[PDB]
From Swiss-Prot, chain A:
GO biological process, one term: microtubule nucleation by interphase microtubule organizing center
Signal peptide start-end: none
Name of the protein this chain belongs to: Mitotic-spindle organizing protein 1
Function: Required for the recruitment and the assembly of the gamma-tubulin ring complex (gTuRC) at the centrosome. The gTuRC regulates the minus-end nucleation of alpha-beta tubulin heterodimers that grow into microtubule protafilaments, a critical step in centrosome duplication and spindle formation.
Main location: cytoplasm
Source species of the chain: Homo sapiens
Taxonomy of the source species: Eukaryota, Metazoa, Chordata, Craniata, Vertebrata
From Swiss-Prot, chain C:
Function: Component of the gamma-tubulin ring complex (gTuRC) which mediates microtubule nucleation. The gTuRC regulates the minus-end nucleation of alpha-beta tubulin heterodimers that grow into microtubule protafilaments, a critical step in centrosome duplication and spindle formation.
A GO cellular component entry from the record: gamma-tubulin ring complex
Major subcellular site: cytoplasm
Bilayer-spanning residue ranges: none
Keyword annotations of the record: Cytoplasm, Cytoskeleton, Intellectual disability, Microtubule, Primary microcephaly
Shown part of the complete sequence: 1 to 191 of 667
Name of the molecule in the record: Gamma-tubulin complex component 4
One Gene Ontology MF term: structural constituent of cytoskeleton
GO BP terms: cytoplasmic microtubule organization; meiotic cell cycle; microtubule nucleation; mitotic cell cycle; protein-containing complex assembly; spindle assembly
Gene label: TUBGCP4
Tissue: Ubiquitously expressed.
From Swiss-Prot, chain D:
Subunit description: Component of the gamma-tubulin ring complex (gTuRC) consisting of TUBGCP2, TUBGCP3, TUBGCP4, TUBGCP5 and TUBGCP6 and gamma-tubulin TUBG1 or TUBG2. TUBGCP2, TUBGCP3, TUBGCP4, TUBGCP5 and TUBGCP6 assemble in a 5:5:2:1:1 stoichiometry; each is associated with a gamma-tubulin, thereby arranging 14 gamma-tubulins in a helical manner. Gamma-tubulin at the first position is blocked by TUBGCP3 at the last position, allowing 13 protafilaments to grow into a microtubule.
From-to range in the entire protein, with total length: 7 to 129 of 907
Phosphoserine sites (modified residues): S100
Family note: Belongs to the TUBGCP family.
Name of the protein: Gamma-tubulin complex component 3
Role description: Component of the gamma-tubulin ring complex (gTuRC) which mediates microtubule nucleation. The gTuRC regulates the minus-end nucleation of alpha-beta tubulin heterodimers that grow into microtubule protafilaments, a critical step in centrosome duplication and spindle formation.
Swiss-Prot record, chain E:
Subcellular location, principal: cytoplasm
Similarity section: Belongs to the TUBGCP family.
Entry protein name: Gamma-tubulin complex component 5
Keyword Hydrolase: no
Assembly: Component of the gamma-tubulin ring complex (gTuRC) consisting of TUBGCP2, TUBGCP3, TUBGCP4, TUBGCP5 and TUBGCP6 and gamma-tubulin TUBG1 or TUBG2. TUBGCP2, TUBGCP3, TUBGCP4, TUBGCP5 and TUBGCP6 assemble in a 5:5:2:1:1 stoichiometry; each is associated with a gamma-tubulin, thereby arranging 14 gamma-tubulins in a helical manner. Gamma-tubulin at the first position is blocked by TUBGCP3 at the last position, allowing 13 protafilaments to grow into a microtubule.
Tissue and organ expression note: Widely expressed, with highest levels in heart and skeletal muscle and moderate levels in brain.
Disulfide bonds: none
GO molecular function, one term: gamma-tubulin binding
Recorded superkingdom: Eukaryota
Cited function: Component of the gamma-tubulin ring complex (gTuRC) which mediates microtubule nucleation. The gTuRC regulates the minus-end nucleation of alpha-beta tubulin heterodimers that grow into microtubule protafilaments, a critical step in centrosome duplication and spindle formation.
Length: 65, 185, 185, 116, 281, 81
């Protein structure tokens, strides 16, 4: 398939758009993890729950520093 | 799944007739910038032209076979004197085969001239000839591990002519004994 | 078209390159899918192989065909054999060039024609200049030491590679006259 | 995949330690994902786009807000994401400022005059 | 069909073989310019009179022009009027509406005359004056370097994102250098005796080095040394061997004028003949 | 279209814009796939490219004619700008 891979290039293009959005906002997230988050909202999820998850997980790496 | 497939090489060829997001389909190289399938079809097409111009009874050898290195190995076996399946004591492959085949055909007829041990100076002389026959036999399979085929005909051009001159000296009626020893002197 | 060219230029003609004695090597020139861009380059490259075939065939014909001893020195004599002996040693980098081309084409068979033409451009001048020097010897039936002047007048040239190349042959012809000269004095 | 197996890869990206070395924060993740799963306000990316503009004026930059506008247009032009509101609200929640009033601020529809 | 299909795919085969140009374009004015232009032409009601516009792909033309600049000739594009490559008006691509196209290929044609004249001059040597070979040697070496640069660009074409405007700006300092050769060679063919026809050429380069006394001057200098090199050899032979030798005398004194060896010329003659007076002992 | 336009700006007049020795690159031709007001926009853009053409001819003719190494220095900086 050829059109099914140009859509994957399209996914990477929006992923770089969200890369610029992540740096101007100063988030710690990288590209692989945001693709995991994209799949999470494919199944449907509260962003308020994902932010509480990540707002526990990042400042539970500051408790073993 | 996404990130596993994302990592591929993208479009760097750009269309000027499909400016908006070109997927690319490769601007079509030349006939001399294509080969080893277009080579074989190119040969087949010219031979098809030649058979049409003949009527189908022209019949050129080597339509396809064999290789590069294995053909080199059979050629190296002929230089010992071990004849091939084309000689005994594309179509242009047959010509290059003939030019190196006749050298080994000469070497066989020199060793066949020295196979026997009258004439006592002739007995010394024949044994002296085989001391260079061994040197010719030693040069092959010491210099090449296995080289390209054109190096074979090119490297053994300076060696085979020296071999060929002694065939003009030899008969293969003919002097022997003192009659040889004066003629040789 | 790729290997075919090298096989013909080395002196093994096929049918793509119909060997003639008046067009030399000349491509078939009747393909209903040929391109005019490649055509001029094909005709230009054919000239080197034509000169090469004429050179080697002459050398083969007039070196080592006797045991050294007519009365004419336009076809015979030690000086004449020394001429061909020097000419063969000058021809070695052409062989080297073709041998490099096969290796690059085995590495990448999609190389363009201009790359090849670019590499052979140094021989492209060298063969026509040296052609007339042997052509005068054969045509005028030049005998004896008049040979040594003939190359010497053409090694006053203003091309450095041609100058050094003819100088090689004149030194080779010098060896044999020196070899008699060491004995007679 | 499925959410329960998806959270553990988050625990390996954000934390550097394995999911067999720590489970307590993985347990908090399970606890908050289980109990409530569906939003309490309506969605539209238009409103959070106008709020991302409000955040970018707030950090005392003004050039990147015109950057975000062409970027948010590209998000529409491609159209591979099923819910575009959630990830933009999500990046909005994790904002960081390197460097009054908050009871006025533009909010979502309350869903108190709304029944599904 | 089993060979023609394979031919058609991997090799172009659409403007030297009777198969009008095939391209799977998408559409839509940014690159559909020619069809838009045809609809505009129909709306202007000529009535029609079609021209020869073949709608061929783009990069092939660049490959052809670069080959033309490297020195080879006889290609499908670029009709020849008297030995002069001129623009072919029987071809369009999509854009440049055949009018801007007609101008840019004309500029390339004006450069192509200067390469054609030189290649014709070279062909008439391998198909004496005692400086022609020494001059064409340096010319040949120039082409050896220049052709390598151009073939490297073609090597980048086999491996694209290159347009016309990239290579013409890249080749700006070379096509400027080409125009100087139109001026040096013109003094070589403006002519009775073959030694005056030599000095009238070599004096041009001897002046043109002082004209710029950048990057051109190195080319002029390396061309000046290789044409004065026979004269260096001949004057040293006159000095050390006590005699001058050239068949039919390629020199200005007998027993228009170069100013190179002129300020020391009197000390040459006075040294040559006097060395002969040592040979007579 | 803009492959054409970004080379019309480089100097080639074409048959969309008409070169003149009073003011070059004049468009008055109407197209229904273009806006009628677009020409005005185009007109402003034309004023740039004309000067770019008028300079290059100036470099061609020089180096009563004007000669000197100063003419090899003014034109030289005109290249880099």
């Amino acid at each position: 398939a050829a059109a099914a891979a140009a859509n994957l290039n399209a996914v990477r293009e929006t992923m770089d758009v969200l890369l610029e959005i992540s740096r101007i906002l100063n988030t710690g997230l990288d590209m692989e993890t945001l693709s995991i988050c994209v799949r999470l909202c494919e199944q449907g999820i509260n962003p308020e729950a994902l932010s509480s998850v990540i707002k526990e997980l990042r400042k539970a790496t500051e408790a073993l520093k | 799944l996404w990130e596993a497939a994302l990592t591929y090489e993208a479009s760097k060829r750009r269309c000027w007739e499909r400016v908006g997001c070109p997927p690319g389909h490769r601007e079509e190289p030349y006939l001399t910038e294509a080969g080893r399938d277009a080579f074989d079809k190119f040969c087949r097409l010219h031979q098809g032209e030649l058979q049409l111009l003949a009527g189908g009874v022209l019949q050129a050898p080597q339509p396809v076979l064999v290789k590069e290195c294995e053909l080199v190995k059979d050629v190296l076996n002929v230089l010992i004197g071990v004849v091939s399946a084309t000689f005994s004591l594309p179509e242009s492959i047959s010509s290059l085969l003939s030019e190196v085949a006749e050298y080994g055909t000469c070497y066989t007829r020199l060793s066949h001239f020295s196979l026997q041990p009258k004439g006592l100076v002739f007995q010394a002389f024949t044994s002296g000839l085989r001391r260079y026959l061994q040197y010719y036999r030693a040069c092959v399979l010491s210099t090449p591990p296995t080289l390209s085929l054109l190096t074979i005909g090119f490297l053994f051009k300076k060696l085979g002519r020296q071999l060929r001159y002694l065939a003009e000296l030899c008969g293969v009626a003919f002097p022997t004994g003192v009659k040889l020893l004066s003629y040789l002197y | 078209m790729i290997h075919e060219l090298l096989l013909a230029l080395s002196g093994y003609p096929g049918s793509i390159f119909t060997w003639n004695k008046r067009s030399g090597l000349q491509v078939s020139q009747d393909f209903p899918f040929l391109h005019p861009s490649e055509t001029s380059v094909l005709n230009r490259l054919c000239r080197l192989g034509t000169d090469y075939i004429r050179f080697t065939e002459f050398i083969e014909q007039y070196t080592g065909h006797v045991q050294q001893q007519q009365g004419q020195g336009g076809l015979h004599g030690i000086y004449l054999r020394a001429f061909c002996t020097g000419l063969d040693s000058v021809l070695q980098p052409y062989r080297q060039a073709l041998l490099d081309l096969e290796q690059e084409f085995l590495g990448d068979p999609h190389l363009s024609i201009s790359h090849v033409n670019y590499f052979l451009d140094q021989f492209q001048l060298l063969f026509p200049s040296v052609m007339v020097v042997v052509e005068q010897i054969k045509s005028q039936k030049i005998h004896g030491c008049q040979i040594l002047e003939t190359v010497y007048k053409h090694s006053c040239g203003g091309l450095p590679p041609v100058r050094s190349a003819l100088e090689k042959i004149l030194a080779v012809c010098h060896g044999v006259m020196y070899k008699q000269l060491s004995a007679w004095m | 995949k499925s959410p329960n197996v998806l959270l553990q890869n988050l625990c390996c990206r954000i934390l550097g330690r394995s999911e067999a070395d720590v489970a307590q924060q993985f347990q908090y993740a399970v606890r908050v994902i289980g109990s409530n799963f569906a939003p309490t306000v309506e969605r539209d990316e238009f409103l959070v786009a106008e709020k991302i503009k409000k955040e970018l004026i707030r950090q005392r930059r003004e050039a990147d807000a015109a950057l975000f506008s062409e970027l948010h247009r590209k998000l529409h032009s491609q159209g591979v994401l099923k819910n575009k509101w959630s990830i933009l609200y999500l990046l909005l929640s994790l904002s960081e400022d390197p460097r009054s009033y908050a009871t006025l601020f533009a909010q979502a529809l309350p869903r108190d005059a709304h029944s599904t | 069909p089993d060979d023609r299909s394979w031919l058609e795919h991997h090799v172009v085969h659409q403007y030297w073989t009777a198969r009008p140009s095939q391209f799977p374009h998408s559409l839509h004015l940014h690159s559909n310019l020619a069809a838009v232009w045809d609809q505009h032409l129909y709306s202007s009601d000529p009535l029609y009179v079609p021209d020869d516009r073949v709608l061929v792909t783009e990069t092939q033309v660049i490959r052809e022009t670069l080959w033309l600049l490297s020195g080879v000739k006889k290609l499908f594009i670029f009709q020849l009027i008297d030995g002069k490559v001129t623009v072919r008006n029987n071809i369009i691509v999509t854009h440049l509406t055949h009018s801007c196209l007609r101008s840019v290929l004309e500029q390339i044609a004006a450069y192509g005359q200067v390469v054609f004249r030189l290649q014709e001059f070279i062909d008439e040597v391998m198909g004496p004056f005692r400086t022609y070979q020494a001059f064409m040697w340096a010319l040949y070496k120039y082409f050896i370097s220049f052709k390598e640069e151009l073939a490297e660009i073609e090597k980048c074409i086999i491996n694209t994102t290159i347009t016309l405007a990239i290579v013409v700006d890249k080749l700006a300092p070379r096509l400027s250098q080409l125009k100087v050769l139109h001026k040096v060679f013109s003094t070589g063919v403006a002519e009775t005796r073959n030694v005056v026809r030599a000095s009238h050429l070599l004096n041009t380069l001897y002046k043109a080095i002082l004209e710029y006394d950048e990057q051109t001057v190195s080319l002029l200098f390396s061309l000046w040394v290789e044409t004065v090199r026979p004269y260096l050899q001949t004057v040293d032979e006159w000095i050390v061997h006590g005699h001058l030798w050239d068949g039919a005398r390629e020199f200005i004194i007998q027993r228009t004028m170069v100013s190179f060896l002129k300020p020391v010329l009197k000390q040459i003659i006075m040294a040559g003949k006097s060395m002969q007076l040592l040979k007579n002992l």
